[PDB]
Amino acid sequence: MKIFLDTANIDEIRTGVNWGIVDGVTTNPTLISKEAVNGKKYGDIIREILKIVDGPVSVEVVSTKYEGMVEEARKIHGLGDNAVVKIPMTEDGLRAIKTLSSEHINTNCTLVFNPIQALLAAKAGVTYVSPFVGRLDDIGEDGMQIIDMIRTIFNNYIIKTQILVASIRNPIHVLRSAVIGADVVTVPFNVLKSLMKHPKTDEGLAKFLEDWKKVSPDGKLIL
Amino acid sequence: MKIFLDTANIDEIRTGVNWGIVDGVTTNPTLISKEAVNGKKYGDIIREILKIVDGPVSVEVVSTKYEGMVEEARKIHGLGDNAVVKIPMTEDGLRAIKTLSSEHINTNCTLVFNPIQALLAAKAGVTYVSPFVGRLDDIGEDGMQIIDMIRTIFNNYIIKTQILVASIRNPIHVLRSAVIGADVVTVPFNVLKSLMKHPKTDEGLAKFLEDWKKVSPDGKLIL
Amino acid sequence: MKIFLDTANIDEIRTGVNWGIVDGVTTNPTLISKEAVNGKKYGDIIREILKIVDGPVSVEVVSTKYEGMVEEARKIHGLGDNAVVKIPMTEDGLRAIKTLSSEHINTNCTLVFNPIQALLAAKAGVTYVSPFVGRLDDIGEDGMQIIDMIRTIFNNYIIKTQILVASIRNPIHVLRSAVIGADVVTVPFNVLKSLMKHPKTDEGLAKFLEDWKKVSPDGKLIL
Amino acid sequence: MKIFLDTANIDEIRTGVNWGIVDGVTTNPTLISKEAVNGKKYGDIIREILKIVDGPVSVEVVSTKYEGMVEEARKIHGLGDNAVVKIPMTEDGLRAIKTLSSEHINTNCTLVFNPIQALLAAKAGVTYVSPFVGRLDDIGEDGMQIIDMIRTIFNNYIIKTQILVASIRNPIHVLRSAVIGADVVTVPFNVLKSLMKHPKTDEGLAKFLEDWKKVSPDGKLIL
Amino acid sequence: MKIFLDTANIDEIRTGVNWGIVDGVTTNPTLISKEAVNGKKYGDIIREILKIVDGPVSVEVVSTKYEGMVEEARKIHGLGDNAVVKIPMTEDGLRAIKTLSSEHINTNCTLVFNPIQALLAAKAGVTYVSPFVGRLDDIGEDGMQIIDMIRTIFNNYIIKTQILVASIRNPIHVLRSAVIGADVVTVPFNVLKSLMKHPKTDEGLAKFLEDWKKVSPDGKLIL
Amino acid sequence: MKIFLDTANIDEIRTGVNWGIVDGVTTNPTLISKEAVNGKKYGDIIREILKIVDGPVSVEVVSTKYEGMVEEARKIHGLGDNAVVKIPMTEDGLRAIKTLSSEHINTNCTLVFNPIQALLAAKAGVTYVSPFVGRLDDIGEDGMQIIDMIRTIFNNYIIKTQILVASIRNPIHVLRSAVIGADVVTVPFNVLKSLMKHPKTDEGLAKFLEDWKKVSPDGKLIL
Amino acid sequence: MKIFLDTANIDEIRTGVNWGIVDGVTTNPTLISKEAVNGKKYGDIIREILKIVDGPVSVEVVSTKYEGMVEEARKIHGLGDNAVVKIPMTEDGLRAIKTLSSEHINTNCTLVFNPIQALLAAKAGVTYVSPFVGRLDDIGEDGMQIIDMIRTIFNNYIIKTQILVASIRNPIHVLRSAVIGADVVTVPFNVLKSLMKHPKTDEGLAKFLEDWKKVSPDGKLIL
Amino acid sequence: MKIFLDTANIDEIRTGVNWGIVDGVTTNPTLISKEAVNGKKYGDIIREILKIVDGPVSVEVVSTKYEGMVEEARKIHGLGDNAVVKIPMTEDGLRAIKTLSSEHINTNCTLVFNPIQALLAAKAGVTYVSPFVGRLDDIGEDGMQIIDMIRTIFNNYIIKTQILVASIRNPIHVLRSAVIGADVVTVPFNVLKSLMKHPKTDEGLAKFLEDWKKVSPDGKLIL
Ligand SMILES: *C(CO)[C@@H](O)[C@H](O)[C@H](O)COP(=O)(O)O
Ligand SMILES: *[C@@H](CO)[C@@H](O)[C@H](O)[C@H](O)COP(=O)(O)O
Ligand SMILES: *[C@@H](CO)[C@@H](O)[C@H](O)[C@H](O)COP(=O)(O)O
Ligand SMILES: *[C@H](CO)[C@@H](O)[C@H](O)[C@H](O)COP(=O)(O)O
Ligand SMILES: *[C@H](CO)[C@@H](O)[C@H](O)[C@H](O)COP(=O)(O)O
């Protein structure tokens, strides 16, 4: 399972990349417009992320019509080979994904909330599909069940579109995504940061240090 | 999973094909009789659908006897390489299917209501079998259960006949068909249209637009 | 399980009540607006339904604010002892329900789409809660799953609010509701009519008649 | 579980009654008209069965209209206190059951093929409901699954109508009915006869006889 | 799943073969003895079936001893390359099967009533094994349970012997055999004919034809 | 299931109480310390919540030693009959709970992270036990699993301690708690407000209102 | 599944081999010592079984120490290429198995009572492992449970050691072993004989004979 | 499944190696420091274990920082081709693992307590991942459930990192690891010794000895 960072915050991205555990980044118009304030320009933020991140970087079109979507998609793709064009689940969006896939431009269908939307995105040829689990949780449905159905459907038809679990809010979305077999999860920075940690790791290391001091007062390992 | 449109309404067909999400069309004598009104001739309608749809188009024979069925079948096939001959689950119908399969004419056995009828059609060599889930719902049986059994039976024997779920009434027939692994669903146009939609997709788009306006008054993505 | 008719069509109501299989009626502002045409007044229609149905009749308030809701509720209640006030799942609606329950006015909380909304309505003291299964099917979730969860939750807490399955579209919603154990279903008239029917009932009757003619030409039972 | 004999053959009935294992009898127009030949009159057959059988005897009305059904039902009931009036699952039949139940005349709703038909019969007040399992088997559906759903539904609502499994064709319908918890099964004579038998019973008795002869050459037990 | 006819009635066999749905025939001494009356001789009956059926025809030996079984088997095989020799599950029978399998004579082990008998037959080299589901039903065990165990056992050891479900009494034996994945079912004629039929098929056909007459008075499809 | 608010923010508490859906409040030292700024004193905050909330209000001791815990508990209890003393799962805490329970002072054992800790708290006499589901989610364990085990354990021994699910982060913690049958959930304000909401509720309301204006221009319901 | 006979009785072995259903033989020191009485010598018994049985014959060492076990194993192996050396699950036994496996002497680890003992034997390279199901039944544990776990473990690691189910006491140990998929069962003679038999096989044969006499008073099949 | 010994006690290691059932050794700073007393030096202990054990020997770094961990890892690697470098699950540790893997130095990530930590270790390229089951048991969670989830995760993504179950306390951790399909278990010496043992093995050997003495007084097997 690939782990992407779901943010447009360049500091968070630099930190996660230096950790070595970030395989890519997803953004959306809200995430970018949050960072593009007090003089900072959205085009610069997007370019900087593309520069910093070695793996895929998803950037969402803002046009709602087919032609504008395809035009924006081509600009995005032209920014770097790792850019992936995020396109919403709409009629025009499916048309745009079909066209872009024929042009070998990588795409990510977003704002997916049920498994048949995900299947339609796959049938249009989309590289990644992003079902939103936390927004479904928000409205009182366990969003992970949609992931489980998508995985079954995609397995049934040997679908090559990658399942990218999005709207992730906690580490159990991540755990359940891995047990189901989702291809990718994209996670906010807070969540990402907690994935490496456990109190018994901290406690065990502390006791190892203490015990080692008994035979090596300076705490080193001389071999 | 392939998605066919279940209608003979030309406008519906044009529009769905235009959305790029329609992989073929099924008709039957009722759907067609519905369109062949006010001077419109059934032959013109059938030829037009063959013309504008790239994928399979199912057209049903009206004869009830073996010889009439094969004669009408050969005419339907002669109309275009994408024509599929729809033939009812009857004794004469199974014989017709065997003959037509020997002649490399594609066939779709219809009016199937249980799994052993579907198996018999497959044994005759039929290209598609069409169990009617909504009509089973109508008589107080969950029609999807028949689709699950047919999928198991066909898996057991590596049967190449495609399961084409028909008499679809709602998007949960579609969802359950995809989780089971049916090869095709055929859907009325209103159902087709509903499959792309979700209130959280609309709401998420609206919010992305509103947030983007904060940093781009013209609401465009200039890169 | 009680079976209500979901309509404001007087003829439908008369006929279903005449069949003796209808235990009450639910309306909403759309169903009524449909009937209040060509000089027919909504007030006359509501009063007439109250008059001819012996069981509960649900009538929805149109105000969106607490005070308007309780005023309209008290009027609806004042129309007959069988009137049940339908009130939407909103903040103002929950407050209205609590007040009205304190006043021993029967209530039905409507536009419920998940199990915790249903639990909140029950906690307000509502007499019936109405989850909308067909509208959930429309957005690609199996609505019956929500009914199962509500039945479990209400069993866990010995909740006395009746589960009234609404937005019913087919006889399998009805069948699954009865297997789950919902207290009530409300059904459109076409659905109601289909519930009595089965092709093997018709065929069995025909055969009994034909066999009886063999020993009684007049086809009667003379004892 | 009560075991009824499903026949109008008076010899079969006399035999099963003398076995001591027959708790009642069901008939239908086909079963009676089969026996009422070569001079034998249907009224005499019905009277003879009522005389012979101590338990319930179901006799079906032939009228299809409410008034005729109720008139015939009253004649049937007047033939003896153990008569039960069999009435088909139709609109008029439900009306007739309601009326008869209010008149304390025992009723049996027949030609039931799904669980919601059975529920409607129960709601009309019917004493027994008879789902037909073998006729469902005939059309490629496992009829026992309907019994299982009816039992769950009736348990959910503490329904007092007895489930009378009919159209029984083999001893496994009987076994499964007992494991499900159906109140009654009605069985053809062939089936009834096989229920007491097993080859290991025969073999065990034979070996007991043989072994006993060793210590009592005349085969008796003198105590 | 292959479907054989279980009968020695030439008219039934001709009829089913002409339907195109019969893949072979099984006979036994009782079945043949029923037809070999009023002058008809068993040898002619056997030869006539072998001539009419292109697929396997199973004919049972009558000897109970190894040498007689093997001699009769060689005669049976001498009647045609489609003859299959039916041999009972006995010590002599297993020896005969082993010898015949070495001689490349196809064999069918019959009178099997549990899964370990079926495994012993497979280990002797038998081509088909026939567990008798109806006769288990007769003694109060669900016979299909035995088919499911045999399927699992044969799958575990990659056994090439075909499971031929025999003593079939109804269409649910056939349905369950297909869902389990038995290789062959052999069915009496009454059962076979019922497999193609369903009331909704007839009803749907009738409605299509009625609708078609609206646009084509002669009921024709002219293309 | 009772629903408490997990906060010490007076405005949130006033708002939720005025909604009529809040059955009590839980606080902890972090929550209170967040509000006790810019002059506001913790004592006033505690007393103000006790005055506003008619239901239980849980207030945590700060002493880590038995004697201090018991003294603080008695002060807390002295503030009002609805005060519940929150005491951590520690050796001292269990001793304090046992003493306080004997004194008829209501108690809430907090900082519980597995089912055996919850059982120890129940055995000390505690009124409520609060397992922390979100903090388990944080370290990569599905916290709801622990609630399910505690429910089963408490049911086995007919334990009267209430399960109060704490550290709730989303509406699915609440849904799952209700399906499990936890006695109480305590939720932060953001979560609480989201529980009443669903997009289909808003959409349905809007459509009803639009339809009603068709028959009542002023949007009124005059009865 | 291979079926071995578990005995040292030469008459039983000769009978079973002559039946054609015995694939090999296991012995142990108790079984041999039982036969080696009244002047019969164990060396003679061992050699005679090796001579009679085509397949594997397991003969157990008596030494408890590594060097003696390996020496005795070499003597056993020298008796015939079908001899398999039975070695107990002990520390020295595992050493002996590893050595003998390196010398290409086939081995069978015996006295195994749980799945991890079986795993250790496999890791030593043993040809067969013999878990003892009946001695586990004797002490109130269902011994077939360990067969199931051993099958799963060996499947997980693609282990080549054959599972040889031993201490078999009845035909249901055999049935369950085949359904699990054990490689081999070794059975006492009484059990072996019972596997071919069933009362309905006997009954069925008798009836076929009787019916055949009708068309052939000879009892012959002339073809 | 590989079985390693979890100790730094040379006598235990020597004994287990000599038994031939030990596939490798894991150590940690606590285990080494326990043995490095009475003048014994950790460098010597480590070297002696590397010398005695043919299989993998895991030796833990003591630095907490990337640079020092990588330096120590290269020293450890330098000691012998069978050295595996044990590195804790920390940010620095994942960085070190990635570096060492790129240098083809075998690694074992330790102090893992949930499945997502294990997944992060696998994504860094680690050779072995060691989840600690007994320490999870110590805090009231069944640690084996974590192994089951890791096995499913690794199977989903075809992960080559071996699952090395650590912190093992009893033989049922071993049995459940084998049934799940973990690649390796590492076990303390007292657990390792109990794995070969069972009371029925001892009892069966004693009885075989006694029975054999009856036919060979010296207890020998002369062949
Ligand atoms: C290395 C990782 O495989 C091992 O030596 C572990 O540190 C121990 O297995 C941990 O066990 P304890 O919980 O008993 O320290
Ligand atoms: C052909 C078979 O795939 C289809 O056109 C079917 O006739 C319809 O899907 C049946 O649907 P209705 O039950 O709505 O006629
Ligand atoms: C009142 C609540 O029981 C009912 O009239 C509901 O409004 C309808 O059942 C909703 O059905 P639709 O989804 O068809 O409007
Ligand atoms: C792109 C799709 O993978 C992402 O940036 C999604 O928009 C977010 O993951 C959605 O998360 P929120 O529900 O928190 O906006
Ligand atoms: C009365 C209802 O209990 C019965 O006589 C039924 O009509 C028969 O049991 C139906 O059986 P068939 O399907 O064999 O007619």
Ligand SMILES: *[C@H](CO)[C@@H](O)[C@H](O)[C@H](O)COP(=O)(O)O
């Ligand atoms: C041969 C074995 O496949 C068949 O002819 C069997 O004898 C029959 O299928 C047995 O059926 P009955 O139990 O109905 O005799």
Ligand SMILES: *[C@H](CO)[C@@H](O)[C@H](O)[C@H](O)COP(=O)(O)O
């Ligand atoms: C008291 C126990 O019911 C509560 O106030 C708890 O402390 C909180 O629910 C803990 O939640 P956080 O993990 O969000 O602090």
Ligand SMILES: *[C@H](CO)[C@@H](O)[C@H](O)[C@H](O)COP(=O)(O)O
């Ligand atoms: C050798 C190992 O396969 C066999 O001879 C076993 O010793 C016996 O199967 C053990 O059976 P008992 O428990 O009945 O002695």
